[PDB]
Design a protein around this motif. Structure first.
Motif, mmCIF file in Angstrom:
data_model
loop_
_atom_site.group_PDB
_atom_site.id
_atom_site.type_symbol
_atom_site.label_atom_id
_atom_site.label_comp_id
_atom_site.label_asym_id
_atom_site.label_seq_id
_atom_site.Cartn_x
_atom_site.Cartn_y
_atom_site.Cartn_z
ATOM 1 N N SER A 290 22.663 4.775 -1.191
ATOM 2 C CA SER A 290 22.685 4.233 0.168
ATOM 3 C C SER A 290 21.928 2.911 0.258
ATOM 4 C CB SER A 290 22.072 5.234 1.150
ATOM 5 O OG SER A 290 22.780 6.457 1.127
ATOM 6 N N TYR A 291 21.674 2.304 -0.901
ATOM 7 C CA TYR A 291 21.004 1.007 -1.006
ATOM 8 C C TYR A 291 19.672 0.938 -0.256
ATOM 9 C CZ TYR A 291 25.123 -0.580 -3.499
ATOM 10 O OH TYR A 291 26.132 -0.719 -4.420
ATOM 11 N N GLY A 292 18.876 1.991 -0.420
ATOM 12 C CA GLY A 292 17.516 2.011 0.100
ATOM 13 C C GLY A 292 17.377 2.385 1.562
ATOM 14 N N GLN A 293 18.436 2.937 2.151
ATOM 15 C CA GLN A 293 18.345 3.478 3.504
ATOM 16 C C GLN A 293 17.495 4.743 3.513
ATOM 17 O OE1 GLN A 293 19.541 2.570 6.747
ATOM 18 N NE2 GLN A 293 19.772 0.557 5.775
ATOM 19 N N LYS A 294 16.782 4.960 4.616
ATOM 20 C CA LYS A 294 15.962 6.158 4.788
ATOM 21 C C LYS A 294 16.850 7.389 4.958
ATOM 22 C CE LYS A 294 14.971 3.545 7.835
ATOM 23 N NZ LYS A 294 15.723 2.665 6.887
ATOM 24 N N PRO A 295 16.459 8.523 4.346
ATOM 25 C CA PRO A 295 17.256 9.735 4.506
ATOM 26 C C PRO A 295 17.032 10.377 5.876
ATOM 27 C CG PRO A 295 15.307 10.239 3.234
ATOM 28 C CD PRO A 295 15.264 8.756 3.511
ATOM 29 N N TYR A 296 17.997 11.181 6.315
ATOM 30 C CA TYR A 296 17.907 11.899 7.593
ATOM 31 C C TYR A 296 17.552 10.964 8.754
ATOM 32 C CZ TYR A 296 17.658 15.772 4.246
ATOM 33 O OH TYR A 296 17.893 16.644 3.208
ATOM 34 N N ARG A 297 18.293 9.860 8.850
ATOM 35 C CA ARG A 297 18.084 8.834 9.871
ATOM 36 C C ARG A 297 17.975 9.425 11.274
ATOM 37 N NH1 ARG A 297 22.156 3.902 9.475
ATOM 38 N NH2 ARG A 297 23.699 5.236 10.518
ATOM 39 N N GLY A 298 16.939 9.010 12.001
ATOM 40 C CA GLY A 298 16.755 9.373 13.404
ATOM 41 C C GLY A 298 16.325 10.803 13.674
ATOM 42 N N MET A 299 15.984 11.534 12.616
ATOM 43 C CA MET A 299 15.624 12.944 12.740
ATOM 44 C C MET A 299 14.132 13.173 12.539
ATOM 45 S SD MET A 299 18.819 14.664 10.669
ATOM 46 C CE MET A 299 18.305 16.346 11.041
ATOM 47 N N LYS A 300 13.584 14.118 13.301
ATOM 48 C CA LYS A 300 12.214 14.583 13.106
ATOM 49 C C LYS A 300 12.182 15.540 11.920
ATOM 50 C CE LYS A 300 11.788 16.400 17.294
ATOM 51 N NZ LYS A 300 11.084 17.122 18.394
ATOM 52 N N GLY A 301 11.011 15.664 11.295
ATOM 53 C CA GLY A 301 10.808 16.590 10.179
ATOM 54 C C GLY A 301 11.263 18.005 10.486
ATOM 55 N N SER A 302 10.920 18.487 11.680
ATOM 56 C CA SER A 302 11.309 19.824 12.129
ATOM 57 C C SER A 302 12.824 19.968 12.269
ATOM 58 C CB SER A 302 10.620 20.170 13.453
ATOM 59 O OG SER A 302 11.081 19.333 14.500
ATOM 60 N N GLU A 303 13.488 18.876 12.646
ATOM 61 C CA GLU A 303 14.944 18.864 12.792
ATOM 62 C C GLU A 303 15.644 18.881 11.433
ATOM 63 O OE1 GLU A 303 15.150 15.334 15.267
ATOM 64 O OE2 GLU A 303 15.597 16.541 17.043
ATOM 65 N N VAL A 304 15.027 18.241 10.440
ATOM 66 C CA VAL A 304 15.528 18.258 9.062
ATOM 67 C C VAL A 304 15.443 19.677 8.494
ATOM 68 C CG1 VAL A 304 15.206 17.379 6.700
ATOM 69 C CG2 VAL A 304 14.942 15.832 8.654
ATOM 70 N N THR A 305 14.297 20.324 8.700
ATOM 71 C CA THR A 305 14.091 21.703 8.262
ATOM 72 C C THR A 305 15.133 22.633 8.892
ATOM 73 O OG1 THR A 305 11.715 21.309 7.920
ATOM 74 C CG2 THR A 305 12.426 23.615 8.088
ATOM 75 N N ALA A 306 15.387 22.443 10.186
ATOM 76 C CA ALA A 306 16.411 23.204 10.905
ATOM 77 C C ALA A 306 17.819 22.956 10.354
ATOM 78 C CB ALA A 306 16.353 22.897 12.401
ATOM 79 N N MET A 307 18.128 21.691 10.071
ATOM 80 C CA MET A 307 19.421 21.295 9.509
ATOM 81 C C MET A 307 19.690 21.970 8.164
ATOM 82 S SD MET A 307 20.599 17.478 8.371
ATOM 83 C CE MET A 307 22.027 17.195 7.332
ATOM 84 N N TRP B 46 2.648 15.386 4.806
ATOM 85 C CA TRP B 46 3.641 15.566 3.746
ATOM 86 C C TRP B 46 4.920 14.768 4.009
ATOM 87 C CZ3 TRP B 46 3.537 21.619 2.660
ATOM 88 C CH2 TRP B 46 2.462 21.895 1.796
ATOM 89 N N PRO B 47 5.545 14.236 2.938
ATOM 90 C CA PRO B 47 6.861 13.596 3.047
ATOM 91 C C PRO B 47 7.977 14.646 3.178
ATOM 92 C CG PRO B 47 6.143 13.586 0.770
ATOM 93 C CD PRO B 47 5.002 14.148 1.567
ATOM 94 N N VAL B 48 8.052 15.266 4.356
ATOM 95 C CA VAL B 48 8.915 16.428 4.628
ATOM 96 C C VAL B 48 10.386 16.220 4.243
ATOM 97 C CG1 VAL B 48 9.783 18.002 6.443
ATOM 98 C CG2 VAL B 48 7.374 17.319 6.438
ATOM 99 N N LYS B 49 10.902 15.018 4.484
ATOM 100 C CA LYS B 49 12.308 14.711 4.205
ATOM 101 C C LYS B 49 12.669 14.756 2.717
ATOM 102 C CE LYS B 49 13.140 12.307 8.497
ATOM 103 N NZ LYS B 49 13.215 11.031 9.253
ATOM 104 N N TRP B 50 11.654 14.766 1.855
ATOM 105 C CA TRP B 50 11.867 14.854 0.412
ATOM 106 C C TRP B 50 11.526 16.237 -0.146
ATOM 107 C CZ3 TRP B 50 10.825 10.483 3.013
ATOM 108 C CH2 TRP B 50 11.580 9.338 2.697
ATOM 109 N N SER C 40 0.816 -1.212 0.000
ATOM 110 C CA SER C 40 0.000 0.000 0.000
ATOM 111 C C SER C 40 0.851 1.265 0.000
ATOM 112 C CB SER C 40 -0.942 0.011 1.206
ATOM 113 O OG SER C 40 -1.770 -1.138 1.222
ATOM 114 N N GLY C 41 0.452 2.231 -0.824
ATOM 115 C CA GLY C 41 1.077 3.551 -0.840
ATOM 116 C C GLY C 41 0.369 4.498 0.111
ATOM 117 N N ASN C 42 0.320 5.777 -0.258
ATOM 118 C CA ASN C 42 -0.347 6.806 0.548
ATOM 119 C C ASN C 42 -1.828 6.511 0.780
ATOM 120 O OD1 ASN C 42 2.133 8.079 0.587
ATOM 121 N ND2 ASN C 42 1.462 9.923 -0.505
ATOM 122 N N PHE C 43 -2.518 6.107 -0.284
ATOM 123 C CA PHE C 43 -3.897 5.633 -0.181
ATOM 124 C C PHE C 43 -4.114 4.420 -1.081
ATOM 125 C CE2 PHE C 43 -5.741 7.140 -4.186
ATOM 126 C CZ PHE C 43 -4.849 8.133 -4.574
#
Ligand SMILES: COc1ccc(Nc2nc(N3CC[C@H](NC(=O)c4ccc(C(=O)O)cc4)C3)nc3scnc23)cc1OC
Length: 267
Positions: A195-212, A162-166, A17-20
């Protein structure tokens, strides 16, 4: 565009399943051959699927998933050509042996599909490795047009979980989505692929990514990723929308580097 339910045979098991909605494997009787298909099955949800179908109907490119048609039966169904190997991130997680040249080949294919989407004045709005599907180990297609928008004739952007990390900074700050914001997403997709399918911004909240990102910081170079490809990632992550490259420029860089690597392989 309207398909016959009795010509469609669905599997019991679900693919994912995707978003919907939910996708199942199926078989559709065409004019002569039978075609293996992936079928999205389900008042707001109905319109969302039809909007997704409306976008796919207008697209015609080798590097984009093709819609076979729609059908209103048990629920509304969106019937698409099957990409047998599935999402790129999941494939690479299971296949760490995949060569760097092969990854470049696949991300270049994505860039060709996006060059076309840009030319067609559609914004994807959900470009991520999960939404690249593999036909073979050497053939990628862009999928999941559920958030996609046809741009107005007079504007080069669409104004909006929203997929904030993208998402590019202007998506967060101004709710503006353009082919340039898709380019930012493509940079994240590149990072994921190398990165062979690793998630970006590992261990970070959306707000922390925006700050970064506001601090000017960017994700590091993945292990084994060529410097030329990391440089391209960073270029995709240009803060300023105007200075950020479009897909024509991105595709050309990938094309030329791919040929360089093919040349090195022959030597
Ligand atoms: C190998 O297995 C497979 C073989 C073929 C396919 N084939 C296909 N799957 C899907 N869906 C669209 C919606 C579904 N998303 C997830 O399952 C998913 C996956 C990952 C994340 C994440 O990392 O965030 C999110 C969502 C898959 N759509 C189409 S259109 C033509 N082929 C397919 C899928 C396989 O797996 C689903």
């Amino acid at each position: 565009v309207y398909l016959d339910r009795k010509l469609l045979t669905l599997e019991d098991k679900e693919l994912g399943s995707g978003n919907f909605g939910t996708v199942k494997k199926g078989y559709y009787q065409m004019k002569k051959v039978v075609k293996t298909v992936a079928v999205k099955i389900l008042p707001a949800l109905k319109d969302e699927l039809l909007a997704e179908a409306n976008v796919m109907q207008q697209l015609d490119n080798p590097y984009i998933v093709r819609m076979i048609g729609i059908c209103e039966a048990e629920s509304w169904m969106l019937v698409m050509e099957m990409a047998e190997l599935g999402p790129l991130n999941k494939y690479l997680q299971q296949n760490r042996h995949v060569k760097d040249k092969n990854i470049i080949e696949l991300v270049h294919q994505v860039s060709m599909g996006m060059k076309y989407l840009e030319e067609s004045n559609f914004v994807h709005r959900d470009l991520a490795a999960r939404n690249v599907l593999l036909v073979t180990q050497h053939y990628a297609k862009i999928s999941d047009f559920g958030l996609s928008k046809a741009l107005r004739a007079d504007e080069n952007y669409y104004k909006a979980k929203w997929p904030v990390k993208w998402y590019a900074p202007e998506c967060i700050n101004y709710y503006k989505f353009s082919s340039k914001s898709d380019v930012w997403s493509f940079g994240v997709l590149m990072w994921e692929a190398f990165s062979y399918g690793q998630k970006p911004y590992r261990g970070m909240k959306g707000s922390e990514v925006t700050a970064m990102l506001e601090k000017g910081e960017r994700m590091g170079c993945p292990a084994g990723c060529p410097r030329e490809m990391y440089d391209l990632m960073n270029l995709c992550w240009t803060y300023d929308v105007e200075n950020r490259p479009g897909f024509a420029a991105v595709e050309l860089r990938l094309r030329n580097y791919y040929y360089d690597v093919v040349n090195e392989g022959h030597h």
